[PDB]
Design a protein around this ligand. Structure first.
Ligand SMILES: */C=C/C(=O)N1CCC[C@@H](n2nc(-c3ccc(OCc4cccc(C)n4)c(Cl)c3)c3c(N)ncnc32)C1
Ligand SMILES: */C=C/C(=O)N1CCC[C@@H](n2nc(-c3ccc(OCc4cccc(C)n4)c(Cl)c3)c3c(N)ncnc32)C1
Ligand SMILES: */C=C\C(=O)N1CCC[C@@H](n2nc(-c3ccc(OCc4cccc(C)n4)c(Cl)c3)c3c(N)ncnc32)C1
Ligand SMILES: */C=C\C(=O)N1CCC[C@@H](n2nc(-c3ccc(OCc4cccc(C)n4)c(Cl)c3)c3c(N)ncnc32)C1
Lengths: 300, 297, 295, 300
């Protein structure tokens, strides 16, 4: 439908503060003040740095379309010297910032659930036949810690290359496929379990293709179980078809979720607490009204 | 005509992504009747890939009227083709057995086998050839009531070489006797709790190996008496393979004494359905008349 | 008589290897050295699980007594703290084991022939009017692919799945009972060494026969072959075919092996030529015997 | 026989290297000097951690009495405050290590055969009435690529962390050891070989494992392992020992598979890697393997 995307007047919105920056565009926290109304509402706006707008509009129209709990939805667009994108605002920000910040605090149960939601969100993309082209811990967002959602997908299509994230087929031949996405998906999984460290740190981007060919893959994190790592390792496979399909990642991660403590070894995991039903429910009402699949602990 | 309903894209929506099938992508769905507040859960299959041709094939599928054959409720025609049928929460038997694999009854497994044959047999009666039959293609309306699906879908339009008969493989010949051979693979899938036949072996190799006689392994649970039935299905000469109609009786007889035929760890601990339990499932889950489940005599 | 059975001092023979463990006794590969002889000649020795020694000897004397192609004759007994039985070594060894190994590569003709061969041996035991009490595919030894010899017959002084209902119910052993034990043995061959009543507890065995739920019929087996097995297992001993009948039926069956037993790709795999077979007899089967039936 | 095993004076032999360490002992590569001879012969020395000396000799006498192609025999022992065990030294050493090194290029025909060979060695142990109590690939030596033998059997009884992952549940829970339990270890042994030396129940604490085995978890199908082979492993891991397969049955089942190895295991470039020619095998026999051994199953 063209119902999904809303055309926003520059008069309609103003940008109060800068949340973040991305290679594609700067981002803001914004107020949308409705025509004919008194109130001012918080929203997140990103304006592209460089910019066939009608061609883009066709792209945005799809971006608006997606309907998954774990996938971000593009509410609106504004066209000017610089294109403006309007979407829901996430206070928590990306997972990457969230995990790095919470490294001492974080516990086994959450990390796996996040992995599952990404798979769910990503799986929707595959069925929709959409290629994100950029899955990274940064790209994913937290509506709330329990609920996380994928984002910034198709932007490359809308319009500075992350070699360390990219799959070998991607690096060598500029080939992007859902399976390529897994390699990134694996990289993202590596990202969380490292609690925000940066892959292939200090290594020249140019050198990267050779190392993958050499088979010197990213090391497995101390917290990470070999069972979990092997899963990561599988994602990083030279042949894309060989790499696990998205569904499998959804199924396997969840099983771990049923028994989170055994798979991931985290200091003081037992002591740190997953949210109580009271804790999750409160968060849901205030922010997460949208009905999303209940998170799996199964042990507790 | 009366049997199959032609929907309007306005009429329903695929809300939840469901499953991946080589034949199709399956979506949980909601049906909104005009003038009505209510929404009805449906299963939607979207087919990857002549409008008239489907209708002839489609009408027959709407046609099937057996407890153990799923019927196609509606067809919606568009750049892509969507097949409407009732939603089964349990979905694949293959999914169900593997998920519940550690624990299952002898009684259930034989009963499914009996249930599958009754359905396959009916298709046989109707002169419908499945071409492709598998555990994956059989889904659970309810635990005691699995139903056979995707029948004849294969014929109309990745090939299941491991499932297929040698006669089917060698010259792409499909017959009811060819189906029977598949049934053993389906019977075999369950007794192994969801395993894969000729697992991981190349398809190219398989046609040669069947000739070599290197048949599927006997499952640990399986009694020889059960394994022999499968072996008969996989006989190279099609005609020699037992008819489903025979197949129904043998499993039904076995179901009378489930423990003697199939060996299970802690089966006694595991519970056959309570009569009360069976009735409760019927009331909400299953409202369709069907033959009664076999119970130990 | 005195001549038939040799009593050997422990000195005469030394065991070398454990081929297998019998339920009744352990079995070894042992070497026999003749007095003042450089040569060591291979034999197989059985040590009983472990009465009166004299009584046992009488039983051995009977066991020595049998001379038949399809029955095994005990050459030697050693009397000591533990009884030892010596009989000629067979490299193929167990019949039951042989089928399991060769199920993929085995021809139709051989299976029928073995059925005929056992039946004649069981029949000799019958004429002598001695009852085996324990016929098993395990207890038949392959002298050569074309020859088999039943053994472990008698051993009364010293299995439910094999055992006949009458024997199981009342500890009754009769020739008719031996036919029932024989019926299982055919199944084992046809099954290619399938374990009968696999996974089923022994306690269940008495009732199911009472129920009447039999051993299943093997895929290779023709309808005709299976029925013979079924006749053999019957509630009333008398109804079950005599061995002579079984010998006659099978041999008739052996004349046209293909019709009775259906084996995939049967034609390609065949019984060896007389020229080959002659080689087998001379090297191993020096013994006077019936030649194998040919279609 | 007394002759079979020889007591040795300290003076005759020395430990020139420490090859490896084991739960029982430290294994040293040592040379043996015969009196009045100018040359040294390589042997393998194992020293115990540290039961009267006479008591030990009786167990030891048994160890040196075992003649089988696939079961290792002990040449000599030295009585001391420490106890030293001497046996032939094989350059390939551990079978388990061999599999790890050779993952890149191990032929299908070999892997099935080692199973025949380990089983053959195991059956003899059963016939002899000896229960190994700690069978693992680690405990299987490689005399030659074609020929591998079983070692370290019966060592376990003398000592007083157990190898829990290998152990049958009966052993874990009630310290019960039987041939049937032994099959379970053999089953694990098959798993290690098939998976090219990967650790069993890796990353999982010992305490959980007895609990997990009851739950019904069993080690995963090796990626290169066909379903037929996996079932065989699975039976071994049965709770009811008696249902669990006997070795002779085990020997028979692998031999059939050996006839058509490619059918029962899938390895990349299995066609490329083929069993060594008779000329190649014959060469090996004479140089390091004079002793007679049972014929290898050949697919041809
Ligand atoms: C295959 C069944 C099994 O487990 N076996 C254990 C040893 C290997 C096989 N086997 N057994 C003998 C064998 C059988 C019987 C023997 O004497 C008993 C006996 C009873 C009644 C009459 C007579 C004359 N003997 C002996 Cl001594 C040995 C085997 C022989 N002899 N050769 C190869 N394999 C044998 C059965
Ligand atoms: C491979 C695991 C490991 O780390 N090892 C350390 C050295 C390399 C391997 N290995 N062990 C021996 C070995 C084993 C046992 C030995 O004597 C004990 C013993 C017990 C039971 C029977 C017998 C005959 N011996 C000795 Cl002395 C040595 C190796 C030998 N001998 N050669 C190469 N590698 C060996 C294990
Ligand atoms: C790691 C990212 C980070 O640290 N940021 C700083 C805080 C704000 C973060 N952020 N980005 C967006 C955001 C993302 C994407 C947006 O439009 C792109 C897009 C692409 C495809 C589909 C859709 C629906 N949108 C926009 Cl407009 C904004 C944030 C939002 N929206 N809210 C809160 N933080 C956001 C980046
Ligand atoms: C185990 C197979 C698998 O991976 N699946 C994906 C998950 C969902 C599973 N599943 N499939 C259907 C299903 C099957 C077939 C369907 O239509 C085909 C068809 C054609 C003609 C006639 C009939 C009767 N059917 C449809 Cl529409 C749906 C599921 C259903 N229906 N419910 C739950 N799970 C289902 C298979």
């Amino acid at each position: 439908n063209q119902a999904l995307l809303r055309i926003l007047k520059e008069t309609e919105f103003k940008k109060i503060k800068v949340l973040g920056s991305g290679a594609f565009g700067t981002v803001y926290k914004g107020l949308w003040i409705p025509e004919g109304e008194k109130v001012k509402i918080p929203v997140a706006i990103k304006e592209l740095r460089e910019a066939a707008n009608k061609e883009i509009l066709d792209e945005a129209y799809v971006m608006a379309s997606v309907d998954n709990p774990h996938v971000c939805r593009l509410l609106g667009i504004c066209l000017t010297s610089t294109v403006q994108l309007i979407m829901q605002l996430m206070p928590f920000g990306c997972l990457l910032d969230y995990v790095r910040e919470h490294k001492d605090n974080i516990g086994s149960q959450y990390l796996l659930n996040w992995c599952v939601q990404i798979a769910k969100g990503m799986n929707y993309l595959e069925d929709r036949r959409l290629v994100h082209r950029d899955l990274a811990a940064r790209n994913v967002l937290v509506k709330t810690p329990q609920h996380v959602k994928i984002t910034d997908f198709g932007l490359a299509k809308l319009l500075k290359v992350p070699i360390k994230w990219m799959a070998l087929e991607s690096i060598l031949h500029r080939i992007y496929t859902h399976q390529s996405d897994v390699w990134s998906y694996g990289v993202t999984v590596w990202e969380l379990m490292t609690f925000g460290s940066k892959p292939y740190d200090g290594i020249p981007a140019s050198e990267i293709s050779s190392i993958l060919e050499k088979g010197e893959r990213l090391p497995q994190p101390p917290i990470c179980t070999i069972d979990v790592y092997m899963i990561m390792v599988k994602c990083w496979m030279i042949d894309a078809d060989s790499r696990p399909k998205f569904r499998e990642l959804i199924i396997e991660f969840s099983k771990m979720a049923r028994d989170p403590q055994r798979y991931l070894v985290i200091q003081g995991d037992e002591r740190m607490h997953l949210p109580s039903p009271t804790d999750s429910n409160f968060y849901r009402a205030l922010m997460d009204e949208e009905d999303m699949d209940d998170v799996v602990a199964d042990e507790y």
